[model samples]
Target chain A: SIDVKYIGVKSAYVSYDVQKRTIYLNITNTLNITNNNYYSVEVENITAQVQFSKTVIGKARLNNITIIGPLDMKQIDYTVPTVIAEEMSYMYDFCTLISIKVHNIVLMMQVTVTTTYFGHSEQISQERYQYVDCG
Target chain B: SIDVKYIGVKSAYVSYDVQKRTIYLNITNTLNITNNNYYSVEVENITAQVQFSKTVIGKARLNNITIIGPLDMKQIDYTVPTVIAEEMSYMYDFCTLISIKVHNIVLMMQVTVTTTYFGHSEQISQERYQYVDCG
Candidate 1:
C-alpha cells in the first residue's frame, strides 16, 4: 500500500466574464514524497470539479473533477499554439485557478509549480514529508 | 472596402503517426499592407480545414475549415502551460505542419512568426509587396 506524505496548494485564481457568460479557474499544486524510488506520481485517479457563486450563464461551463498532473509536453506543444492564438483574439480578460490533491504518497519529496498569465509566470514550491515510512 | 495586397505561404510540414492514426500540418503566412493605417487582422472571417491520408483511427480527428490566426498572446499565456504539460505526458512522439492563406489583403507589409517546440524556437519572416495600391 502507498502512503501520502505531503500535499500543498501553490496558487489559485478565478475570472468571470459577464458578456461571454463564462468562468475560468486556474490552480497549481506541489507534492513531496518520502521514497522517490518507491513512489511515483499517478494523476490517472485524480479528478477535479468546479462550481460558481452565481447562476451559470456562459457559453461554456468549466467541468469539475479534472485530473491535472504528471506533466505531458507533446499535448502542450500541439495545443498551445492554437489556444494562445485564440485567447489573444477573442478573450482579453480571463483568469484561471488551480488546485491539487494527492493520495497514496509514501516518501519524502518536494514539488514545484509555476503559472503564467498576462505575459508573466509565477512559481511556487513546497516540501512534502519530513520522515520516511519504511514499513 | 478591404483589399488584399499580397498572399504567400511561409512554411509547411506533415507528420503521420501510425499508432495514433493522426496527421498534423502547421503552416505560416505573412501579408503586406498597402495602407498600414487602414486594415486590421480579422481572424473571425477566416477558417481552416485539415484532412488525413489514412482512415482516422485516433480518438480525435483534426477538423477542417479552421482559421489560423492574427496572433494573440493573452490566450497563449493562459493555455500554453497546460498544453505543454499534457503533451509531455501521454504522447511522446508527435509532429505538426503549418499552412497559411490570405484573402482581402489591402496593403504592403511584413509578417514574422516564431514557433517554439521542445525547449527550442524557430522563426520565419516574409516580405509582402513592393508597391502599395491606393485604389
Candidate 2:
C-alpha cells in the first residue's frame, strides 16, 4: 500500500490550559509518501477524539495548517474541556486528577489530505494512546 | 480498522557490513494498539524488499523477537547484500554510490505478527522511500 510512517510520542505530554479551561495533548509527526507524485499535499480539517472506558468524552480541531514535504514533519496540538468540575468540588485539584487518568485512554486521529494535483481531499482515521504513572 | 504508525528514520542510513559482506539499514519502531486486547503479540519473520526502476533488486530479513504492549514501541533493523560488487567497479567506492541511489528507488517493509492468544500469524506489508541528490 502507499505508505507514510508516523514517528510516535517523540514529544508528547498532557497539559492544562487554565485561561481557556481545557485539557490538551501535543504530538509531532513526520510523513512522506512515495516519490511517484508531482503534486504535494497538506493536512487539512484535522480533528481528534479522546476516549475513556471506550467511549468518546471530548474532541478538538486545528485552526491552522501547511504544505507537506518528504519528512514534512510537523507538530499537532489538541484540547478538550475538563468534565472534572461536575465530578469534583475543587475544579483544579480533582479535575487535574481526572485528566491524568484519561492519559491511558485511547486517542483518535482523524485527518483529510488535499493534494495540489486533484485537491480531492481524502479522509484518514488513525488510533493511538498516551499514559501517565502516579507512582 | 487496525492501525500502526512507524517513527521514520528515528535512525536510518545505508552502510557496509564488512564482517558479514553486506549492507544494512537500522530503525527503531514504537507501536500502540487499541485497548480491546485479550493477549500479547510479537512481530516475527520481518522482511524488506528493495526496488529500482520498479523492479525488485534485493531482499533482507531479521532474526529478532519481542512481545508488544499497548504502547509496545520497539526498534527494528535489517540488512541486505550491497549486491554492490556487481553494480560498481569498486565494491566500496561507487558501490557506496549504488547504495545512495537505491535510497529513493523504493523500499518495502513486510512482516508477520503472531499473537499469544491465537498462536497464529498475520502478515503485513508496507512500502516507503529514501533519496539524495548531488545536483
Candidate 3:
C-alpha cells in the first residue's frame, strides 16, 4: 500500500449573494506521498472535496499522471474548483443576522480525499475548521 | 448651523465564538465637520453605530471633545468601541452553511451618526454594504 500523509489546508475563500441567494467557494489542501516499494509507482488520480451535512460544496481533481521514485517522497497540492449553488437561502438569513455583531467567525469543515495506485484504490477523510471575517 | 458631511466607513472587524455563541465587533467611520459659524465651536459628543433589524450591533462614541476653527473644515475619525454580545447562535448556523461554498459575501449595513452642536443636537443616518470573506 502507498503511504499518504495529510497536511494542513493551505487556504479557503467563500462568497455569497444576498439578492441572488447564490454561493461561491474555493479551497486548497496539501498532501505528501511516499513510495516505499523497490519500483517506481504511478498515481493515477487524486480527488478531493469539501462538504456540509454530507452535501458536496466544493471539489477538485488531479487527473494528469504523477510518478514517484522508489523510496522517494513527493508533495502535492490540490486546488479545489469553485462551486456555485443557489439552494442555500437559509444561509442568507443566517449570515446577515450574525454580521450584525460578529465580524469574524470560525467554520468547521469536512473534507475527503480519494486516490488510486498500483491497481488498488483507497480513500481518507478528515474534519477541520478555519476563521473568516463577516461582511 | 454647522455643516456635517458624512465621509465613509473606514474599516470594520467582527469575531465569533462557536462554543460560547458570542460575537465581538469593531467599526470605524469618518466625518467632515465645517464650522461655518463666525467663532470657534465645540462638538460635545459624536456617536456612531451599526444596526441589524433595528437592533444596535456595534457602536462608537467620541467624547474627548473637538473644536473646529471658524470657516475651517476638519476631518474626524471614530474608531468605534468593540461590542460583545452572547446571543448569536443563529448566526453560527447561518455562516457555517454559507461557508460550505460561498467564500466572499456582501453585507448591507445600516449606520447612524449623532452629534451635539453648540446648543441643539442633530442626527443623520444612511445604509451601505461591504464585502467579507467566509471560512
Candidate 4:
C-alpha cells in the first residue's frame, strides 16, 4: 500500500485564467534529491508528458507544465489533490505519475505508487526511474 | 490688374483620404527665395491662422498646410479658386493672401492681387511674410 508523502517536494505555484479557462502548473523542488545528485525530471499525466533537466540544491526542481481545461472543480480536485485537494480526490486509487531519471548508476531507484479518489473511479499512476552508464 | 506669375517655385504633392473625408496639402515650393532668405508663411481661413518658417535652397520652400472642411463644392471652388478655379469664383472678391516679408530692405515686394469666385459667400486667405535684420 502507498501513502501520500509531502516531505520531499517543497512548493508549487498554480494559476488558472478565468477568461481562457486554462490551468498552468509550476512545480518546484519536486524531488528530494540533492544538488550534486540531481539530473533530470519528467512528469506524465493522462493528457501530456513533459521532461526537463535541472540542478538540485534546495527543495525540488521547478518544472513548468500546462494543462488545458474547462475542467470542473471536482475533476481538478480529483486529478491533482496535492495541488488542488479537498474539492476532489484521485480516481481509481491511482496517483499522478512523476519520474526522475537520474544520471549515475549507483543510486537505487524505485517505482511510483498509485492512488484513487473516493467519488471517481479513474486510475492515475506515478513512477521514477534511474539510468547508468557502464563501460 | 495684377498678373499671375509662375516662377522658380517647384513641385507639390497633395493627397486626400476619402474615408476620413480629409484633404491634405503639401506645398513643396511657393516662393523662389534662397537659403539666406529669412521668412515665414501663414494660412488664414474663416476660423484658424497657422504660421511657420523654413530654410530655402532649390525652388521655393516646402510648406505644410491643412484646411478643414465638409466644405461644399461651390465653397471650395470659390474660396481657393487659384488652386481650384474656372468652375467657381472667389466669393465677394477675395484673393488668397500670400505676403512674402523679407530679411533686407533691398527688394521691393507688392501685395498679393485680389480675385473673385462666383458661387458662394465665404472668405479664405493664405499669406507669406519675411522677417528682416537691419544693421
What DockQ, on C-alphas, does every prediction get? 0.01, 0.02, 0.02, 0.00
Write one digit per residue (lDDT tens) for candidate 1, span B14-92.
Answer: 2111222223223232332232232222222213322222222334323332332222223212233333222223232
lDDT of 3 at A26: 37
What tens digits encode model 2's per-residue C-alpha lDDT throughout A58-88? 2333233333222222342333332211222
Best by TM-score: 2
DockQ of 1: 0.01
lDDT of 3 by residue, A64-111 (tens): 334322222234232334342433232334343212223322222111
lDDT of each residue in B24-120, candidate 4, tens digit only: 2332322221223222222122232222222234433323433222211221111211232232222332222222221211211111121111112
Q: Please report, as a residue range, the 10-residue window in candidate 1 chain B with the lowest summed lDDT.
A: B114-123
Q: What would the per-residue lDDT of candidate 3 be over residues B1-135, giving only the tens digit for each residue?
A: 233222232211121112232232232323332323233333233243222122232333323344321222234232333342333332234443212223332222111122111122222222233344544
How accurate locally, in lDDT, is each candidate?
0.24, 0.26, 0.28, 0.23
1 versus 3: better TM-score goes to: 3
- Candidate 3 CAPRI grade: incorrect
TM-score of 3: 0.13
Clashing pairs in 3: A13-B103, A14-B102, A14-B103, A14-B104, A15-B102, A15-B103, A15-B104, A103-B14, A104-B14, A104-B15
For each candidate, what TM-score against the reference? 0.11, 0.16, 0.13, 0.09
Highest lDDT: give the candidate number.
3
Q: Model 2, range B36-95, lDDT digits (tens) per residue?
A: 323222323323322222222233232332332222223423223322113222221111
Superposition error at B34 for model 3 (Å): 72
Candidate 4, residue A31: how far the Cα is off, in Å:
68
Pairs that collide in candidate 2 are: A7-B7, B28-B75, B29-B75, B30-B73, B103-B130
Interface RMSD of each: 35.0, 33.3, 36.8, 48.1
